[PDB]
Amino acid sequence: LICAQKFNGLTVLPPLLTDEMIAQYTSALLAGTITSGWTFGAGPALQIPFPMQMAYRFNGIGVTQNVLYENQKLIANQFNSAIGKIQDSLSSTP
């Protein structure tokens, strides 16, 4: 059984990074992406407004800068909605 892992000469070492510290790493990685775009991954983190940042991500795939701003309300409602369904997507399919 997994409750008593000792058994007979079978020790399960604990991970060096606890689930809490890993969550701190992920949260620090989320806050870097949101508040700094990619600049935090290549030196110091430089703050940039998120609507402005995602225009730069748009500009990197071909669509011009102004496509995002003229569709900010639609795009945000699209993102929000999707990030939602992803929670039920994992729940629906075990």
CA torsion through residues 90, 16, 18, 28, sign: negative
CB of 92 to other proteins, least distance (A): 27
Q: Which is nearer to other proteins, 74 or 82 (CB)?
A: 74
Interface with other proteins, residue 78, by CB under 8 A:
no
Q: Which is nearer to other proteins, 27 or 89 (CB)?
A: 27
- The closest alpha carbon to 55, from 45, 68, 37, 36, belongs to 68
CA torsion through residues 15, 21, 27, 33, sign: negative
Q: Which residues bind other proteins (CB under 8 A)?
A: 13, 15-17, 21-22, 24-32, 34-36, 38-52, 55-56, 64-66, 69-70, 72-73
